[PDB]
Amino acid sequence: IDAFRLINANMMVLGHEPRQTTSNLGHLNKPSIQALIHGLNRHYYSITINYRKNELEQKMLLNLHKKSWMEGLTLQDYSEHCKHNESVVKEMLELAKNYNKAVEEEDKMTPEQLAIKNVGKQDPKRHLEEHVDVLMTSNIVQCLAAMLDTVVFK
């Protein structure tokens, strides 16, 4: 929101440096090179800003943006939770075979070479610990949410 305002080209012809800095508040942000290509400091000047906040709006946006209504008190497709759980584990097996593949070129050429070299084909490591987290948070939430309703509902 870099707001500006004109500086006098008359005073530019005078060669007189304007705006008489009396406070360490102006030269804090650094200007963009594209504005330096444009007028910037030959025709106008920069202005620092801030934002006026209160308490009253901050809460009524914070509590009013993304509030799930009763969603976690559901069961999430009770046939297909475990079926999707299969649908990750099945290729997680062969990705674990890649984890039985990628360990076996250690004690080899200088693992920065193992950093430049793994740029064409996927690693089992990061891809593995992805799916472990996905199955974990996929299962535990449905597990507990399945069990609150047995107490709360009779």
Partner: protein, 52 residues
């Protein structure tokens, strides 16, 4: 020959007929991962045990 399955009674010839595949896809697919990872830990000797 397992093309049909059930039972055959000998006293009076009764064929209780029943069928369901309970769970097949799950425990074996989670199982062969374990025997992959055991081989991985066997490979971890050859970068860990001999090394340091």
């Amino acid at each position: 020959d397992k093309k049909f399955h059930g039972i055959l009674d000998q006293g009076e010839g009764v064929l209780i007929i029943f069928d369901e595949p309970p769970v097949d896809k799950t425990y074996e697919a989670a199982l062969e991962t374990i025997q992959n990872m055991s081989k991985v830990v066997d490979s971890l000797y050859n970068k860990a045990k001999k090394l340091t």
